Symmetry: none
Subunit: 419 residues, 4 copies
Amino acid sequence: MDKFRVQGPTRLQGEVTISGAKNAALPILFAALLAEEPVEIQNVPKLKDIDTTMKLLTQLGTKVERXGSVWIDASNVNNFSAPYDLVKTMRASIWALGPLVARFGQGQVSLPGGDAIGARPVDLHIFGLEKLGAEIKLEEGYVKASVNGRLKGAHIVMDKVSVGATVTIMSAATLAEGTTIIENAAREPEIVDTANFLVALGAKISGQGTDRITIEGVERLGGGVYRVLPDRIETGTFLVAAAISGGKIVCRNAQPDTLDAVLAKLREAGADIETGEDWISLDMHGKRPKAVTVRTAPHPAFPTDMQAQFTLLNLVAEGTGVITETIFENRFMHVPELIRMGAHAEIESNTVICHGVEKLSGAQVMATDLRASASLVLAGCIAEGTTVVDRIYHIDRGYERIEDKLRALGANIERVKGE
Amino acid sequence: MDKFRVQGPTRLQGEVTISGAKNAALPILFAALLAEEPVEIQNVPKLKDIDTTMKLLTQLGTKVERXGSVWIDASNVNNFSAPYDLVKTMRASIWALGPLVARFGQGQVSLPGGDAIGARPVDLHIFGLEKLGAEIKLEEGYVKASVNGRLKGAHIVMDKVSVGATVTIMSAATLAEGTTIIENAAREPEIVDTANFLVALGAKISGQGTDRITIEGVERLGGGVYRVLPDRIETGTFLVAAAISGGKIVCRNAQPDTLDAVLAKLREAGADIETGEDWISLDMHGKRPKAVTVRTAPHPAFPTDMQAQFTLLNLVAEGTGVITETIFENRFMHVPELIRMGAHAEIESNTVICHGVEKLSGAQVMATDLRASASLVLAGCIAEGTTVVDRIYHIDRGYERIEDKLRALGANIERVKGE
Amino acid sequence: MDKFRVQGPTRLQGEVTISGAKNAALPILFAALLAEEPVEIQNVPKLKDIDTTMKLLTQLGTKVERXGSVWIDASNVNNFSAPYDLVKTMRASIWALGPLVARFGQGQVSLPGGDAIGARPVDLHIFGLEKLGAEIKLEEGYVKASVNGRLKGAHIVMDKVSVGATVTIMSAATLAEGTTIIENAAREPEIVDTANFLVALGAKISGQGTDRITIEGVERLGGGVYRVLPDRIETGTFLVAAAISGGKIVCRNAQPDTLDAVLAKLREAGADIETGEDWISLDMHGKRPKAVTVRTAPHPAFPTDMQAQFTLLNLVAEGTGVITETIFENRFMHVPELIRMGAHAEIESNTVICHGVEKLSGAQVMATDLRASASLVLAGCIAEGTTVVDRIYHIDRGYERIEDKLRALGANIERVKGE
Amino acid sequence: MDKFRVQGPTRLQGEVTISGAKNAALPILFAALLAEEPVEIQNVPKLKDIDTTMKLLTQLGTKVERXGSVWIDASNVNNFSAPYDLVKTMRASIWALGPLVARFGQGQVSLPGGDAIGARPVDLHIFGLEKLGAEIKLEEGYVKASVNGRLKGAHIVMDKVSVGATVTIMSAATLAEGTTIIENAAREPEIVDTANFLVALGAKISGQGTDRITIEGVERLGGGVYRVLPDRIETGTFLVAAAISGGKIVCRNAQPDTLDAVLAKLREAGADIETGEDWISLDMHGKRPKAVTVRTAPHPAFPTDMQAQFTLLNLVAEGTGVITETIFENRFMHVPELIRMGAHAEIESNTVICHGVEKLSGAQVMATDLRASASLVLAGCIAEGTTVVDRIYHIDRGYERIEDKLRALGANIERVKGE
């Protein structure tokens, strides 16, 4: 059971190369099923989900080999089933459905259930396929989609904005016969990257990143080389690491435009920010951060995923700042951990009232949420003494070797195996 | 088109006989498909929906006829599908699905378009069935249910309280193998009625009316005679009719226990209400009504179906009273009409601030909503001069010949053809 | 820093007598400021708040004493101010305001000023008093209320259900001229109890319990003897204590009607329950509980103060159960604690998915919330080994001798002082 | 009763000069009370509310005059109370409180109010002034704010986001001692515009337009010349005007940066848009508009104030488009009116499903909503034949002689008294 042991305090400064987004990576990987010719997917991160996806693809009859990139060859997909084993460890596995039926005319995914009716996330995917002409079948712990020939483009009005369903409906429509319109499509930067990847293979797609995606079906998708987009939330994690440490840092392999709100936010905190075509720089100028007010909201507004980070920023900032969760519920569960470290805070309703203190004190902390967990490793860096972040496997799922990045930044971090 | 011409103002008084609730009759008629013996359903109102349910049952090979009662003998049922024409003009038709598969092993109902993804009402039905072990098929614009042998009892958790879905599950479970339990069950008097009907056939149901329904499957269901409960909304409409005119009315063939919230509210308005086994008396003593404070909510709370009626009550009462909607958005269609009738009111988000006025004035009015429309006709009754409600066809579908009832109360009503 | 050291597993069983509710004794204790003649308030618990209230009444010039009953003589209330010192620790102190201005024409309570403008609790109190005629001054961290003569009855429409405001408005209405009507009043048993106390004093109150309370002002209130109703939550806590341990328990000095929702829920879990006039019996018959579905909501529905307790129930119950919080957000702190005890659950939004395990393990836990903390103690009672609940003072402020009662029940529990 | 008589179809094209934004003018007019020196507010529209504000100001002792500009000299305010007679028709009048108390230590604004407490819009203002150290006096029908000397800078956290309160708190903080921080401040362009005004008078303000506004109190405010910002909603109405008629239009006196979401939206509809620092041009190139998907949301997202307008666009555009009211309820009352003109649409809960038709047809129409009404006048413009919009005084209260502008644009419009 891996743990992080940190020596504080350490000023975070220097350089960090942002990894590719697991979130753009996943759906792009599934979409690669559409390709007739080989595909090179670059800038893919090394995370559990990528591996599970690799296993899944190979199992469909796909040729898969990885490194910096992942080499996909979907020319010989023979099997059409996503087994129980694979689709229980990873929700994203639902994405195999659409391509399979769009390109092969058939597909089946395992169906973990037991739960509440009218709840299932998959419900949106299934109905999306149904509107496309696919024949759905709910049997044998399964969900089967099939069509004779091509899928039919349709005008689809989304009732609930859904990242997952937008990818499935969009992907499957590239091969559909006719035009498909997705009303209320997810705006996420990841959706845009997936659209672009599709466009690169030969698909005709437009409106990506807006409330309306329009797909013009084509007969087939080729191959080629595509670069997965940088990790927006990771960038924000390192940007915050300098902002709370009086540091100066430059973010390489970054994508500024996917960070508008976090940048404006960092500025409010009195940070000297600069951006280039592919990089972002933050200079605290030895200064202490200025407490900010935060309101999480749907993209392109303040990302909820950057919430715990900002809560830490307010925690070691000059003055008071209140963070509000416009969206979610129960996202503060990690705060008490911070309190045990010398942080002054009041969880009130859907908000967290932040009372900035000069210096945090090392301690024993644990958070299961990846963001909240990473926020803890950050605190250890600026706290006085020794901090132990427990159960970092959580972090590993979403962070490509973070201790290494933090170390190059000057952090006194150490991966402690088997306690 | 057929319109109504009322002569105001007249005091609505005397008696009215309450019709059977179309809403209970509906699922009951469908449930009769489970009956292995002839079934006589008493007290069924003469409405469009009933005719259509009949057309539908006959086309399954069911022996049906009607007068005050609807006779059903599902002895020669050889057809297992509800064709498009039927389902289109009546959403309730999804009700044939559960019984068909529960009793015969198979069943298919038509499925129209439009219903945005994640906003389809039938979604809950497909789900409940699937939980019972049914194989589901979404092909040909059809929703298909089939099972090998009997349906399997299950412990289902309702994500959202659904009247339709609760009826479908409860029904299918009566023929299932083992026990079925519905968490978050809709509590509607209508559901209770359908349960009572099933028990009359020999089903084993309990908890009907509460948030939790328990069904123990049995081998077969018999036959018998069943009286459909009185229409609660109808009774409420007539209670208000007198409430807003100093009159005294006695509703016959009524069911007091289904009117808790409405009866209480009426007392608040200053009404002298009395009740018996099967009747309800309301006396204004020539008195004008008092503005009340209404908040709609799930049964047994204040019914949204009584909403428009009460706005009318406030609009002619003493004082200011706010009416708040928490169920239906856009259910304020009547207000603009009542305004044009001399009423003063302000609409704020999901409420209506009413400012009572002594008298109303005739006018050409129109509302597409069943309840608003019937409310308009009421308005015309106490309004000054001549009032004309267009498109009354909406009222015809939910109200069993309302003119004869209003006329019988001292009203100056009059249907009008041509247009 | 008091600690609870529990030795599990121990089957909770036998008998426990329920204390008076702190939450009824508080508003009633304040209402006593209305009585011109001596008063006896029976069944008042021995808790921090009761002491702070007593001290407050004493400062006002009231002769105050206690044991089981609290003796009060407010015949000579000579001081009209509640200073910072006396109120810093107790929000309920706002209750001194209404009584003071209704009987004496002047009153003032200290306002700790940290609130976020918009959600400030006294807001409703201030508003109702004003609707009653009182002049309100917000000066010197003091909330001031004055009136030349008597308060004037009024029709008050509650914009938000407020147990606080409701009590303040109800209480003062008793001494005002004419009638007062509170639309949207809080329905809490505690409010009914406060009302009963008022009527017992010669007040004219009807509607308590419902959403519409009518008060008929009188001239003076006399004296008399009054019995505070039993603590519904405490009872619920003891009821669940057995339910989770296979035990049988008889709650003495209880009141079954305040527990409709909680009793029906226990039955769902498989408890053999029986009630009397002042008692409730719960028998598990040696059986482990059955997972249940819980949706909190405004009284008379499932109580949010029972939440944590029912979560514990589900976590060691048979199957998967769901707990949904509609009342408060951020009320899941107990979950991560219990999870450290061997429990299995996922927190999704306003809900917690429960996966009942057979046995729990002793661990070091802590919850700042009253209920969560008590829940941890019950967990420890049924967990294998030694559990240590830190910060038990939270429990101390709310439960009368929790340790004794649990002890008499079979628990192996000890108060560890100063760690 | 004024009506708009419109003969269509006609192509709207040419030039229009955007008037001053009523929403920024009102708050500045009030802020002018802080100025010890003659001030000239330019670009003020000729609207009913302005006239009311002027009267209120004169009634205070302020020398007031107007044309395009409103000349103000409040170096000698003598009457510290806004009377019932003046405030009776304008909520905005609550804005006199802040300046009155910050500058002269006392203010009294009359309040009208039937019943019901909590809510009330003024709540926020009264409480904010209190956080600043103002002594508030509350008696039904009025609110008095006083302070002995200067107000004291404070840290205020808004529980609810309020345009009104933000102006009151931001304004009265300019004269206070120390710093006042407003967490959760409204971000509207008008808040930014009001703030800029204060800065032009010597105020120290930063953050306007973001979630956190910070004010550094100064000794006094001066005078000068200031220009109210263009009317964003007005500009939107004019763009759509050409956008739905196939015409081309240039908006003079515009401020492009307050229209990001609407500009992008029009671009989606296929409009060819260009902009300058103070102009905006729209060219359909004789082309019919493209159906778009619209999600209204808080600034700077798609403005709910632009919705009715956009719905019109969809109703005569090519294809299907859905408009969702993400925040506000019952925002579609006007739709029926448009359907009466030949529109094809469905109102589903919080959304409108648009089916673009070729040509609308004249008809008698009415809407109370400012924007909705303005939508109908536009529809007349493009519809076939004669359209009669009743109750246009609504349009009169927010638009600076729309009839005139529409005429120069090529419309056949006429202000008439009867059908």
